[PDB]
């Protein structure tokens, strides 16, 4: 099928590290993995970037 | 050295520079950096490092 948004970013996140996913508030995200260390692995549907971010920076949207 | 902040979310480092947080951890924040990372001392663990800034709230002075 198609890429479906799973989450929305609610806080700004600016990477310090090469594996991180930059977030702006309101970014639509497709979260691929919620890791046990409370990082999320995702595709940012605004930028097309992929990476990890601190998991409490996004809320689930389930249309 | 008195508490400035309280952790509100669990944060487990992936990176060398990061500060581990448990919920309710007392923090002394030295810098709120312009890239939305906080630079702090965890007053429970005695560790120093950085964490994503919205993981801590200011305490009632």
Curated annotation (Swiss-Prot), chain A:
PTM entry text: Phosphorylated by MAPK8, MAPK9 and MAPK10. Phosphorylated by isoform 1 and isoform 2 of VRK2. Hyperphosphorylated during mitosis following activation of stress-activated and MAP kinases.
Subcellular location as annotated: Cytoplasm; Cytoplasm, Perinuclear region; Nucleus; Endoplasmic reticulum membrane
Tissue/organ expression: Highly expressed in brain. Expressed in neurons, localizing to neurite tips in differentiating cells. Also expressed in the pancreas, testis and prostate. Low levels in heart, ovary and small intestine. Decreased levels in pancreatic beta cells sensitize cells to IL-1-beta-induced apoptosis.
Domain of life: Eukaryota
Signal peptide: none
Location of the SH3 domain: 4-63
Biological role: The JNK-interacting protein (JIP) group of scaffold proteins selectively mediates JNK signaling by aggregating specific components of the MAPK cascade to form a functional JNK signaling module. Required for JNK activation in response to excitotoxic stress. Cytoplasmic MAPK8IP1 causes inhibition of JNK-regulated activity by retaining JNK in the cytoplasm and inhibiting JNK phosphorylation of c-Jun. May also participate in ApoER2-specific reelin signaling. Directly, or indirectly, regulates GLUT2 gene expression and beta-cell function.
Oligomeric and partner information: Forms homo- or heterooligomeric complexes. Binds specific components of the JNK signaling pathway namely, MAPK8/JNK1, MAPK9/JNK2, MAPK10/JNK3, MAP2K7/MKK7, MAP3K11/MLK3 and DLK1. Also binds the proline-rich domain-containing splice variant of apolipoprotein E receptor 2 (ApoER2). Interacts, via the PID domain, with ARHGEF28. Binds the cytoplasmic tails of LRP1 and LRP2 (Megalin). Binds the TPR motif-containing C-terminal of KNS2, then the pre-assembled MAPK8IP1 scaffolding complexes are transported as a cargo of kinesin, to the required subcellular location.
Written domain comment of the UniProt record: The destruction boxes (D-box) may act as recognition signals for degradation via the ubiquitin-proteasome pathway.
Disease implication from the record: Type 2 diabetes mellitus: A multifactorial disorder of glucose homeostasis caused by a lack of sensitivity to insulin. Affected individuals usually have an obese body habitus and manifestations of a metabolic syndrome characterized by diabetes, insulin resistance, hypertension and hypertriglyceridemia. The disease results in long-term complications that affect the eyes, kidneys, nerves, and blood vessels.
Miscellaneous comment in the UniProt entry for this protein: A chemically synthesized cell-permeable peptide of the minimal inhibitory domain decreases brain lesions in both transient and permanent ischemia. The level of protection is still high when administered 6 or 12 hours after ischemia.
Family: Belongs to the JIP scaffold family.
Protein name from the UniProt record: C-Jun-amino-terminal kinase-interacting protein 1
Species assigned in the record: Homo sapiens
Encoding gene, per UniProt annotation: MAPK8IP1
């Amino acid at each position: 099928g198609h890429m479906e948004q799973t989450h929305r970013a609610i806080f700004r996140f600016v990477p310090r590290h090469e594996d991180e996913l930059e977030l702006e508030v309101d970014d639509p995200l497709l979260v691929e993995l919620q890791a046990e260390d409370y990082w999320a692995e995702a595709y940012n549907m605004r930028t097309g970037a992929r990476g990890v971010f601190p998991a409490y920076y996004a809320i689930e949207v389930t249309k």
